[PDB]
Design a protein around this ligand. Structure first.
Ligand SMILES: *[C@@H]1O[C@H](CO)[C@@H](O[C@@H]2O[C@H](CO)[C@@H](O)[C@H](O)[C@H]2NC(C)=O)[C@H](O)[C@H]1NC(C)=O
Length: 304
C-alpha cells in the first residue's frame, strides 16, 4: 500500500438536513451494508459515516440518545468494524446545532461522552469532532475540538483515534491561513489526527465535476503538508473528489501521489462519497453504478 487508510464516506443518515428529526426512508436513509462490503472487497479499509447531531441526541446536546436513530447508525458502524475496517463516527454539523453555532464547550463535551460511551470498547471506531467548522471564531473552534477529545476520553473511549477538524470547512488549502491555532490540541492517548478536506473545483466547494487544472490537487495540499511536517502532526484527507474527466483524474492522481510520498504525515484519505441515495451524483462511489465508482475506483485502487 501507499497509505495506512483509504476508503470512502458513506452518506445517507445526514440527508434531508432541512427536516429534523425527519423520517427514515423519506428524508434520510442508512448506508447499505452490502454496498459497503463491495468496497471492502475492493480493498477499502476505512469508512466515514455522516449523521446529524440533532437526530442522534434530540432537543439538547446534553440529552439522551434517540434509540431508533442510534440503532440504525450503530448497525452500519458495527458492520464496518465487524469486518475489521475502521468506522469514522462523523456528526455532520458544521459546528452548529439546530443551526446555531456551538459555543458551549461543556455541552459539546457532554454530547461526546454520551456518544463515545456507546463505542468505548470498539477499537476500530474513530471519532470525528464535527464536520467542517466554518464561520466561527478560531478560538471557539479549537476549544470545541478540545472539548470533544475530553468527553471522548473521560467516557473511557481511550484507544480510538480522534479526527479533529479546522475552521473554514477544514480545507487543506486554507489551513495555514485559518487553522494554525490547532497545534494547541492535546489528548492523553496521543492519537490525534488532523482531518482536512480538499476539493478541486474553482471555489473548493466540491459541487462541480470540473477541476481548475491537472495540478490543482497537489498545489492545494502542499502548504498543509509542511504544517504537519513542521509541527509534528498526523493528517488524514477526510473528504476528496474529482469529476469523471481526464483533467480531474490527473489532479487527484497528482495530489494522492504527493500525499503518498509524504506517508510520514498523511495517514490516508477517504473519497466523497458512497452511499445508497446518490444516484446520478457526479461523485457517487456507490456500486454498481456510481459515476466515481466506474472512473475513480480503478485509479484509487492503485493506492490501497
Ligand atoms: C445494496 O447493494 C447491493 C449490491 O449492490 C444491491 O443488490 C443489487 O440489487 C439490484 C436490484 O435490487 C440487482 O441489480 C443486483 O444484482 C443486486 N446485487 C447484489 C444483491 O449483490 C442492493 O439492491 C442494495 N440495496 C439497496 C440499495 O437498498
Amino acid at each position: 500500500s501507499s497509505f495506512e487508510w483509504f476508503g470512502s464516506n458513506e452518506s445517507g443518515a445526514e440527508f434531508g438536513s432541512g427536516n429534523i428529526p425527519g423520517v427514515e426512508g423519506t428524508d434520510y436513509t442508512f448506508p447499505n451494508t452490502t454496498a459497503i462490503q463491495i468496497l471492502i472487497d475492493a480493498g477499502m479499509n476505512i469508512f466515514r459515516v455522516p449523521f446529524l447531531m440533532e437526530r442522534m441526541i434530540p432537543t439538547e446536546m446534553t440529552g439522551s440518545l434517540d434509540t431508533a436513530y442510534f440503532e440504525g447508525y450503530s448497525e452500519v458502524i458495527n458492520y464496518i468494524t465487524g469486518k475489521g475496517a475502521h468506522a469514522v463516527v462523523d456528526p455532520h454539523n458544521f459546528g452548529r446545532y439546530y443551526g446555531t453555532p456551538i459555543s458551549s464547550t461543556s455541552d459539546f463535551q457532554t454530547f461526546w461522552s454520551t456518544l463515545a460511551s456507546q463505542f468505548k470498547s470498539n477499537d476500530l471506531v474513530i471519532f470525528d469532532t464535527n464536520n467542517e467548522y466554518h464561520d466561527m471564531d478560531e478560538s471557539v473552534v479549537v476549544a470545541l475540538n478540545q472539548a470533544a477529545i475530553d468527553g471522548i476520553r473521560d467516557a473511557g473511549a481511550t484507544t480510538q483515534y480522534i479526527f479533529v477538524e479546522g475552521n473554514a470547512y477544514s480545507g487543506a488549502w486554507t489551513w495555514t491561513t485559518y487553522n494554525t491555532a490547532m497545534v494547541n490540541l492535546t489528548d492523553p492517548s496521543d492519537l490525534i489526527v488532523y482531518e482536512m478536506h480538499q476539493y478541486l473545483d474553482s471555489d473548493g466547494s466540491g459541487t462541480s465535476d470540473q477541476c481548475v487544472s491537472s495540478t490543482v490537487g497537489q498545489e492545494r495540499v502542499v502548504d498543509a503538508t509542511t504544517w504537519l511536517q513542521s509541527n509534528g502532526k498526523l493528517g488524514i484527507l477526510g473528504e476528496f473528489a474529482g469529476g469523471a474527466n481526464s483533467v480531474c483524474e490527473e489532479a487527484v492522481e497528482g495530489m494522492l501521489d504527493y500525499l503518498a510520498e509524504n506517508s510520514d504525515v498523511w495517514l490516508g484519505a477517504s473519497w466523497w462519497s458512497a452511499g445508497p441515495w446518490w444516484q446520478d451524483y457526479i461523485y457517487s462511489m456507490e456500486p454498481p453504478n456510481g459515476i466515481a465508482y466506474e472512473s475513480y475506483l480503478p485509479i484509487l485502487e492503485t493506492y490501497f
